[PDB]
Every structure is written in structure tokens, then in C-alpha cells.
Design a protein around this ligand. Structure first.
Ligand SMILES: Nc1ncnc2cccnc12
Length: 338
């Protein structure tokens, strides 16, 4: 009942913000630009510093004209509307949003420890206790999101930031969506796509649980279970029903992964009548204190090395390009609700 009442209150608070989203809560010249942290086909993420408070933030900047061209309008409205409405210990916090003639802006707490991707590649692979610590946070985050009728759809090591206490902060809600029933958009990263996405079926929250299986495999092995030079070759392996496990995997880990990487979505863990409890009660999680994880009372496997809230040493170097704002408004109608 404690879990039921927790999720009931979580949905109440989410729906209130979902129905009346915040808008236009800062502007660009409130911030100093420090460094580019990441870049993509229609946007980038910048470390900025608020000029009055001195607080650091990660500012995601989306070029409206490129969003329209790459057909991401609904997705970018999804991302901001969901992000301003959620509240959970392992979700990055959105502090401000706003738009101008050229760009959409989402200003989030800056997580200085870097992406899980970098740490995993630097160490090679995580021990099973280490992987289990991160996986538990994802299980709880998906329990939270799915109860709000949200699907995340972009689980991968690059989107999991390690914070100052060594806990996960999920970033990038670019593909997240509120869904009652099924949805159909082809999106995600090829290595992490469930078979039903590849086969163009109407799919549901089960694709997140599949992605968790890929993520746990990758954390524990150092590479994802379906790998190839071309995406088409990755897709053939995903739909085949065949995964090979390293010998060092425990029997409990292999058993959990066979049930998360179940190609038949009606037999996949997290999508059965017991929902998430088939995962939480699995023998691989027998040592996990779910409440202690939620309360951030478990000592983390490692704390990232960084010097302070403005340290960027755990992120990589990108060409520094202008943040240009046109003298004319672009795509005003398409982003009216942002
Ligand atoms: N919130 C963030 N904090 C730190 N680095 C990031 C990189 C990409 C996206 N978001 C962030």
C-alpha cells in the first residue's frame, strides 16, 4: 500500500504540472556561456552560468528550423512538457525553459560527473554489484515513469549521468512520450531497439524493459549484446532470439537477461501481470534494498573525480559554435505551446 499511495501521489503531482505547463521562465542573456558539452543534428548542450546567482546549468539548445526539417516537432514538445512535470530522484531537473526567434531552450541542473558511457569505456566493464546499483535506479525510474503513462525510449549509457554522490541522473527526454495503449514512432538507438520497434509494430512500455536488458548486458560485459557494423545487421541479430553470454556472467544475471531480452513482448519481464515486481523480486536483485536506493542511502560504487560544480573534465571537447538568434521569428506557430 505504501508503494500504491506513493505512485498515486506521484501521478497527482505530475498531472497538475502536465495540464498547466510552465513557460518562459528565463531568457538567454541571464546566462554566460562556458563550454559545449554535446552536439547533435538539431541541437547542442552547453554549460552555462547564471549571471545573478552564479549557479551552473546544462542548457539544451534546439534549432527550431532543424527540428521542423528533421520532423522532431512533437518530440521536442513532448520532451519539455514531460520534463517540466516530472519529479524523481534519478531524473535530471529542469529549472528553466524559454524560446526566442531561432531556438528552444531547456535549462537543467548541471551533472558534473560525466556520462556513464565514458566511465564504462574507461574501466572496461562494471562488476555485477556495480551494474546492479545502476540497474536498480533505472528499475525504480521506469516504475515511476510507466505509472505516469510515460515511455522513455532512449535508454543507453550516454544518457545516464553520474552525479556528485555517484548516483544516476537520466538525461535526454527527446523521445519520451505520454502513451495510453500503443505508440508507433521509429526512434531510439539501434543497439537498444526492441524487436517490435524494428518490425514497425504498435509498441508499449515493454520496449523500455528490453532496453534495460541491453543496458545491464552492456554494463556487465563492456559491450552490448547485439553489435555489428551496419544497423541492418544489428536488427537481424535483435529479432533472431539469440544472445550469447560471457562465461563470467552469473547464472542469476543470465536468467534475468533472458527474461528482459525476450523477443516475444507478451512474455517479457516488466510486461507480465506482476509488472515491475517480476524484476524487483528476481534473484539477481536479492541484495538490493529498494527503499535505500530510492533514499540515496547506499554507498555508491564510485564517486566521479571533479573539482567543483563548474568542472568539465569529465566531458569531451567540441568545436565552439555561435548561438545565433535571427532577427526574424522562425516557426512561431509550430512551437506556440513551448
Ligand atoms: N544535465 C546535464 N548535465 C551535464 N551534462 C549534460 C550533458 C547532456 C545533457 N544534459 C546534461
Amino acid at each position: 500500500e505504501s508503494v500504491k499511495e506513493f505512485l498515486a501521489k506521484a501521478k497527482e503531482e505530475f498531472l497538475k504540472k502536465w495540464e498547466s505547463p510552465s513557460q518562459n521562465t528565463a531568457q538567454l542573456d541571464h546566462f554566460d556561456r562556458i563550454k559545449t558539452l554535446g552536439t547533435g543534428s538539431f541541437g547542442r548542450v552547453m554549460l552555462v552560468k547564471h549571471k545573478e546567482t552564479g549557479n551552473h546549468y546544462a542548457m539544451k539548445i534546439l534549432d527550431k528550423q532543424k527540428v521542423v526539417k528533421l520532423k522532431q516537432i512533437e518530440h521536442t514538445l513532448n520532451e519539455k512538457r514531460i520534463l517540466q512535470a516530472v519529479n524523481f530522484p534519478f531524473l535530471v531537473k529542469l529549472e528553466f525553459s524559454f524560446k526566442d526567434n531561432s531556438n528552444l531552450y531547456m535549462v537543467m541542473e548541471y551533472v558534473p560527473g560525466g556520462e556513464m558511457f565514458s566511465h564504462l569505456r574507461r574501466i572496461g566493464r562494471f562488476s555485477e554489484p556495480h551494474a546492479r546499483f545502476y540497474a536498480a535506479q533505472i528499475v525504480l525510474t521506469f516504475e515511476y515513469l510507466h505509472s505516469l503513462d510515460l515511455i522513455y525510449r532512449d535508454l543507453k549509457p550516454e544518457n545516464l549521468l553520474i552525479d556528485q554522490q555517484g548516483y544516476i541522473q537520466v538525461t535526454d527526454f527527446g523521445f519520451a512520450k505520454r502513451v495510453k495503449g500503443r505508440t508507433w514512432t521509429l526512434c531510439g538507438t539501434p543497439e537498444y531497439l526492441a524487436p517490435e520497434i524494428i518490425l514497425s509494430k504498435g509498441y508499449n512500455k515493454a520496449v523500455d524493459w528490453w532496453a534495460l536488458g541491453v543496458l545491464i548486458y552492456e554494463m556487465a560485459a563492456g559491450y552490448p549484446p547485439f553489435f555489428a557494423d551496419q544497423p541492418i545487421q544489428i536488427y537481424e541479430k535483435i529479432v533472431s532470439g539469440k544472445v550469447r553470454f560471457p562465461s563470467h556472467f552469473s547464472s542469476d544475471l543470465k536468467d534475468l537477461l533472458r527474461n528482459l531480452l525476450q523477443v516475444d513482448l507478451t512474455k517479457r519481464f516488466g510486461n507480465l501481470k506482476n509488472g515491475v515486481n517480476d524484476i524487483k523480486n528476481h534473484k539477481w536483485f536479492a541484495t538490493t534494498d529498494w527503499i535505500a536506493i530510492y533514499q540515496r542511502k547506499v554507498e555508491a560504487p564510485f564517486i566521479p573525480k571533479f573539482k567543483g560544480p563548474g568542472d568539465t573534465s569529465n566531458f569531451d571537447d567540441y568545436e565552439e559554435e555561435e548561438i545565433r538568434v535571427s532577427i526574424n521569428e522562425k516557426c512561431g506557430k509550430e512551437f506556440t505551446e513551448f
